[PDB]
Amino acid sequence: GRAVPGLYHHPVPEPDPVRVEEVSRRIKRWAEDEVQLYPEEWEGQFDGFSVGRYMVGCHPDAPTVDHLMLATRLMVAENAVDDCYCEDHGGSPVGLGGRLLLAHTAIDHFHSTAEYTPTWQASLAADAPRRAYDSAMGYFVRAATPSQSDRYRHDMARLHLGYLAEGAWAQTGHVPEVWEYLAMRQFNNFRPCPTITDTVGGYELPADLHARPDMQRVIALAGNATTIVNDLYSYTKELNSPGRHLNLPVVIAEREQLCERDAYLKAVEVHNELQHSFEAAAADLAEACPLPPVLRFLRGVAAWVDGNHDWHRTNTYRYSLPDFW
Amino acid sequence: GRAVPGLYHHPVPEPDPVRVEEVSRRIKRWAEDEVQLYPEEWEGQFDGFSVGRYMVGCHPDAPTVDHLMLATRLMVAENAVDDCYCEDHGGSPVGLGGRLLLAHTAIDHFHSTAEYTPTWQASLAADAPRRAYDSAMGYFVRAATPSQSDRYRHDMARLHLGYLAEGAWAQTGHVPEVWEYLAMRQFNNFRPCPTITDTVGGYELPADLHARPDMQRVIALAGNATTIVNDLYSYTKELNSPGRHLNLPVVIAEREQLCERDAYLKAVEVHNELQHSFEAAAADLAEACPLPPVLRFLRGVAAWVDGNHDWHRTNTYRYSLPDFW
Numbered sequence: 055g056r057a058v059p060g061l062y063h064h065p066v067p068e069p070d071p072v073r074v075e076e077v078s079r080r081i082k083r084w085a086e087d088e089v090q091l092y093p094e095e096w097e098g099q100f101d102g103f104s105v106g107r108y109m110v111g112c113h114p115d116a117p118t119v120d121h122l123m124l125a126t127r128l129m130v131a132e133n134a135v136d137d138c139y140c141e142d143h144g145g146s147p148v149g150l151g152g153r154l155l156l157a158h159t160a161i162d163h164f165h166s167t168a169e170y171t172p173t174w175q176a177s178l179a180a181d182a183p184r185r186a187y188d189s190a191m192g193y194f195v196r197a198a199t200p201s202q203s204d205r206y207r208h209d210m211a212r213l214h215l216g217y218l219a220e221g222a223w224a225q226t227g228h229v230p231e232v233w234e235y236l237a238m239r240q241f242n243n244f245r246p247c248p249t250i251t252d253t254v255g256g257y258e259l260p261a262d263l264h265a266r267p268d269m270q271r272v273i274a275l276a277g278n279a280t281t282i283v284n285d286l287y288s289y290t291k292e293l294n295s296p297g298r299h300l301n302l303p304v305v306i307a308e309r310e311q312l313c314e315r316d317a318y319l320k321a322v323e324v325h326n327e328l329q330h331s332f333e334a335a336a337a338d339l340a341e342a343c344p345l346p347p348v349l350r351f352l353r354g355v356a357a358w359v360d361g362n363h364d365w366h367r368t369n370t371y372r373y374s375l376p377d378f379w
Numbered sequence: 380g381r382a383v384p385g386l387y388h389h390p391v392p393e394p395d396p397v398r399v400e401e402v403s404r405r406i407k408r409w410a411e412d413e414v415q416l417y418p419e420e421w422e423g424q425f426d427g428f429s430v431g432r433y434m435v436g437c438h439p440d441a442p443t444v445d446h447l448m449l450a451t452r453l454m455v456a457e458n459a460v461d462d463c464y465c466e467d468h469g470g471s472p473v474g475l476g477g478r479l480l481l482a483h484t485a486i487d488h489f490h491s492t493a494e495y496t497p498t499w500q501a502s503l504a505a506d507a508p509r510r511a512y513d514s515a516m517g518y519f520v521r522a523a524t525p526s527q528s529d530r531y532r533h534d535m536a537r538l539h540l541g542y543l544a545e546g547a548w549a550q551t552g553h554v555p556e557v558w559e560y561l562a563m564r565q566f567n568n569f570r571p572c573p574t575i576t577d578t579v580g581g582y583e584l585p586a587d588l589h590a591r592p593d594m595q596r597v598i599a600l601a602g603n604a605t606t607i608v609n610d611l612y613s614y615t616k617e618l619n620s621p622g623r624h625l626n627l628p629v630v631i632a633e634r635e636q637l638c639e640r641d642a643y644l645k646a647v648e649v650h651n652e653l654q655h656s657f658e659a660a661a662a663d664l665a666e667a668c669p670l671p672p673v674l675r676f677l678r679g680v681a682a683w684v685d686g687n688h689d690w691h692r693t694n695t696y697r698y699s700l701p702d703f704w
């Protein structure tokens with residue numbers, strides 16, 4: 055459970071085991087009883103995600119487990135989609151854009167005639183990814199303000215666009231330029247998770263404040279940094295993925311023609327600059343706009359980011375490190 | 380210049396020729412001098428779009444030509460992308476998801492390190508689609524509120540997702556179910572155009588009101604209806620597109636195994652139900668929430684929709700009708 059050497063990060067408290075255990079039992083019931091998420095054989099993979107620790111660690115300010123469950127269901131649904139549609143065996147399914155758009159309608163609803171609406175409605179139960187999105191979004195919409203819901207839909211639209219760029223490149227084994235990879239990884243990104251911190255914390259960042267260019271930069275930087283964290287921790291895992299799975303070290307090595315080690319080390323330095331820039335941008339906004347909802351939201355994003363690093367560091371079931379130090 | 384027989388629509392006044400002519404000259408200068416939109420050989424296609432009439436007709440309440448130009452630049456950029464990336468010769472480019480995401484960064488900016496940011500910045504001038512988005516969004520961002528800008532980015536994310544579902548299906552000649560086609564056509568949709576009516580009208584629909592579920596349904600229905608208008612007017616044109624280009628009549632005919640004529644006629648009935656549903660949903664919201672910005676926005680969406688039908692009806696350069704009556 056050691057951190058990537060040289061990776062700039064903040065330690066976090068051990069997550070409340072009582073909350074962890076309650077989330078674990080509730081998410082299991084949701085997955086099995088409400089959305090039929092998986093067949094028996096894939097239960098170990100489910101528990102291996104440690105989503106309870108994940109979310110408790112990422113949302114220390116959640117007033118209740120009900121609040122935590124808003125994020126937990128969405129996290130599990132997000133994984134289910136990426137696992138079932140995107141990582142569909144082979145490099146990338148040619149029909150990904152069609153599958154994702156139809157799944158997207160479970161988040162941003164189809165509106166149509168009396169004839170075609172019911173047929174769409176029925177598609178929402180047709181597979182696990184869509185049952186998962188549909189149910190999870192349902193809970194979110196009931197608890198969050200209309201603005202918080204709209205905000206999440208936009209961030210999900212971003213995520214799906216990110217998936218589709220990754221999938222399009224994989225169809226030809228295209229290795230993008232480093233900045234091009236990073237642009238993709240700005241969208242194919244944890245962003246929809248930290249941005250619901252206010253909903254999960256029981257308050258609202260007003261839409262007009264969310265929309266500020268400086269806030270938008272703060273959010274992008276945070277997502278970018280914490281997403282590269284995944285690149286770093288999952289690097290060894292991905293060397294075994296079908297084809298040549300892209301992550302920052304792999305793209306750096308291939309484009310800049312460096313050895314894997316030097317490319318990985320630079321990738322750590324890239325993460326560090328992103329993380330520091332996020333923190334500086336956050337401090338600047340905290341000062342420029344010291345409204346309580348803004349300050350809470352900024353603190354919650356940082357907590358999510360720190361929690362996300364902690365979850366990656368400790369998840370030895372999913373991840374391990376390269377021998378580069 | 381006759382309307383599709385049986386198509387429910389509202390007549391509109393002749394657009395102010397003075398405004399039309401001023402938009403025409405300004406958009407030509409933008410296209411040629413600012414963004415180098417096209418080489419000489421494709422000027423006829425440019426003028427053939429009649430974008431001046433289009434926008435004046437669609438935004439009767441614009442206080443100035445500067446306001447009209449906000450929408451006009453974006454319309455022209457939207458076309459340029461769809462023409463240059465999506466209709467790239469052949470059915471659909473395998474790398475579409477990558478090209479669109481990078482173009483999307485001209486709308487929703489990349490945030491990164493000191494090293495990679497400049498390389499991204501340089502990509503914004505690399506082709507006409509990106510010069511067009513970048514410049515047009517630049518003008519929009521200067522004139523609109525941060526919320527109006529965020530709203531447009533979400534609607535552009537929707538549009539690009541729509542492109543990618545269409546492109547993914549085209550890669551295998553997949554004909555979706557009718558409702559599946561309509562779900563795609565809900566995103567691959569004029570929506571980003573009528574939704575900027577308030578910006579172009581010099582006022583703001585507040586974000587919290589935009590976010591209301593009833594408003595979201597009103598917007599989706601309006602976009603859905605006015606987008607099927609295009610299916611109907613461009614049907615004959617598309618019979619000549621590479622492969623089998625999908626539109627509502629073609630999908631209805633293929634899935635429900637009907638002759639082209641009966642499928643087209645049903646497609647008109649589908650349009651009509653969508654249009655009526657939009658109007659009823661709009662009346663319901665006008666009554667439920669009689670705030671001035673809401674009422675103006677609802678009237679502007681309807682004006683855009685009526686204007687969009689008028690532009691299709693009169694554009695005999697681009698469109699013609701089937702002999703089905």
Ligand SMILES: CC(C)=CCC/C(C)=C(/F)COP(=O)(O)OP(=O)(O)O
Binds near residue numbers: 288
């Ligand atoms: C939670 C969410 C919004 C999306 C899940 C996909 C995503 C954005 C990641 F960053 C997971 O990284 P990766 O796809 O590389 O998954 P890994 O196998 O390394 O854990």
Ligand SMILES: CC(C)=CCC/C(C)=C(/F)COP(=O)(O)OP(=O)(O)O
Binds near residue numbers: 457568572609
């Ligand atoms: C203006 C905008 C946001 C996007 C342009 C693409 C689009 C959504 C259309 F509806 C054009 O229809 P089509 O793609 O069938 O173009 P046609 O060739 O029939 O005129």
Ligand SMILES: [Mg+2]
Binds near residue numbers: 136
């Ligand atoms: Mg993935």
Ligand SMILES: [Mg+2]
Binds near residue numbers: 285289301
């Ligand atoms: Mg990874």
Ligand SMILES: [Mg+2]
Binds near residue numbers: 461465
């Ligand atoms: Mg098109």
Ligand SMILES: [Mg+2]
Binds near residue numbers: 609613
């Ligand atoms: Mg058409």
